[PDB]
Symmetry: C6
Subunit: 160 residues, 6 copies
């Protein structure tokens, strides 16, 4: 699995992801290239339609569930706690997905964009220290999401 | 090897699986042959008959449960979200199952067809880089759907079956 | 080792016909039990607070599967479903040593799972029945009960 | 871990465990010595207070007593004695019998059969209530008991 | 590095007597602690009732059972007797061990219970599949009237009643 | 990568005093952090309630207890004292570490709690089968009235009240 990279813009704190993937921020895990992006080691997101469970037809509108990414303790974490606790809305959250390319390197092939996100949950876990880093799960609702397969040219979107 | 390939046609978006298994869509995992089919790494489906008591035998209408497949982030995924969000009815979903053949190659031996499918759930999960435990693995997209009719076909050996998922 | 299941249905006849032939299961073909389903798992519970619980076996996508769905969805009762259990014997081969048969079985659940995002897809078949008999064929002991 | 051997006597079917651990019954896992006892690969048992005894259970394979065990379960046959002999590695090379658990007029309450597919040999969990249990550390002299 | 526990009840005399001898355990015989139960596991919780939203402090300390896990040793029938008869155990004393400078084991911590009562005995024997060193396990859970914690090597006591 | 926690109590003073010294933890002695507890695990959640099939932000944020896991060290009896007596802890300070360029551990993050209260202490010792060559674990959970987060290496801070 290749890591994804997330650029976060805040209404109060500006470029929250600024310097997130630098040596000062993440250490020997430094990634040359995405200095102003958080490196996401996990992502999860669900979208659902309630169903009757008997006829199989929907029993209500679609429901968006929070978008989540997991990172380590990087330079953005104190800023993310500020946003969570102060209710700061983020006008843009943009995740860039990567895969192994022909040349051998990673290529950006997919994009997920959230508009006016709000952080609803931050979960920190340090696995037992006796190659892994502490984990920080950031969950977010939003007002609109757009999906883009950049390499093949397909996009879609929806409001919350 | 043993992934399945799924052709999806939508009543609004046409051939949703178009080009899903091409190099631009999935990269090094592109499979020449199934260009207009989604590559599915997992599949799950349940059909059940109520028993309802210590009585112990069938007691009510059978219930079909949603059919689901899991794929990676391919060219159709934005289209699939469009289908989920707009309630787009999918007139045909066709699953082709594969196994190792006599000669050593992959063989198509089973087919599952859905008629008037509707996507009810899309769950995206990316496992983490856990020091070569998830080297082979990729982000996964579990797509679930209900339908109005299913056909089961063992193409290699001749046997077929079918059933309707009644509305009421 | 796998178990082998002969299934006879009151509407579709020998449901197990050709289940374990190369055309049905591929390189997993077993050239002994052509007309039996090869079961990779089996589970069954009988309990008192007697209540029998459904008998279950798990197979892959073999040629009887479309017929098993027909039985389930149509409520076809199966007059006999017979399990033959095997073990490796003294010399070197597998020997049949146990049989469980069900009488007037009914399929109540079919759960299909494809794994591994080097094994095979799995299909769990669960069944009620009206009578079950057990018989350690190798040792002479038998038992039976009604539902 | 070494397996245990259980001698089960039933009020209707007699020595249920008779020949349970012989060549014809369990195959290459045949170990001569406990021919008239079932070879148990697992055991679990709980007693708790808010006394409450919970069922004693053992796990075996498809052996010659299993069809008889289903008869006991299905008819409610009271089994006047159930005796488990526990074994451990000794100073020398063989296993030594060091513990015994004895139940009086047990009743089988549950039989759960499971067969897995990197594994070996299907498992059958037999659970039973009882009217009295005796615990005995054979090697050291201490005993205990209680009624249900 | 297992713990070693001494148990006395008001009716049965030294319940842990000879618990860790060959006659009691066998090839796992470990000299020295002959009259103590060798515990392979221990678990214990103490808690304060919460009130999550507008949080911190909805109640009075709650003690939960102290439990240890051993094998089938000579004290087990004695423990079942204690469980079944409701025998009050005036003292249960746990000695914790760690790697020392010398190469041997050093006793550095003690947990004491006063008027303990056995609340649960769960016996589980894992499948012979391999597990060349696994053995039967016995989880014994105890209530008590007072617990004392002592870091013997460094000092520092603490205690509380249930 | 283990973290080190300095704990100050309003009744017992420097509770973490000598927690990581030889008398306290043995050959796991750590010169540098003598007056800090060594933490193997830490867990902490902060959340905002939301209207599920509606707009997101409803209701007050909810801070949840901060937790750390250590072994049986010199501070444990004091930590039990704080739990059972409700001792308010004016400062809890966590220093997080990572591998540096030079090869040594570097301090890069700090988490501080103000007026902490211990709400839960869970002691669990694993079964010494292979695969368990490490020590007993003690989960200490605390609520607090203020927390400060600091990325020391990069210059970011944030904070909140409870």
């Amino acid at each position: 699995a290749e890591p994804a990279f997330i650029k976060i813009e805040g209404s109060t704190q500006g470029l929250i992801s600024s310097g997130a993937s630098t040596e000062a921020s993440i250490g020997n895990r430094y990634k040359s290239g995405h200095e102003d992006e958080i490196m996401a080691q996990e992502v999860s997101h669900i979208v659902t339609v309630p169903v009757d469970q008997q006829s199989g037809q929907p029993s209500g509108q679609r429901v968006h569930k929070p978008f989540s990414f997991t990172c380590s303790l990087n330079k953005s974490v104190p800023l993310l706690y500020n946003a969570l606790t102060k209710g700061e809305r983020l006008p843009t959250v943009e995740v860039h997905w990567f895969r192994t390319a022909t040349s051998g390197g990673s290529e950006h092939f997919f994009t997920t964009k959230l508009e006016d996100a709000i952080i609803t949950n931050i979960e920190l876990i340090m696995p037992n220290a006796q190659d892994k880093t502490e984990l920080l799960k950031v969950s977010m609702s939003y007002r609109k999401v757009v999906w883009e397969h950049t390499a093949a040219g397909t996009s879609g979107s929806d409001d919350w």
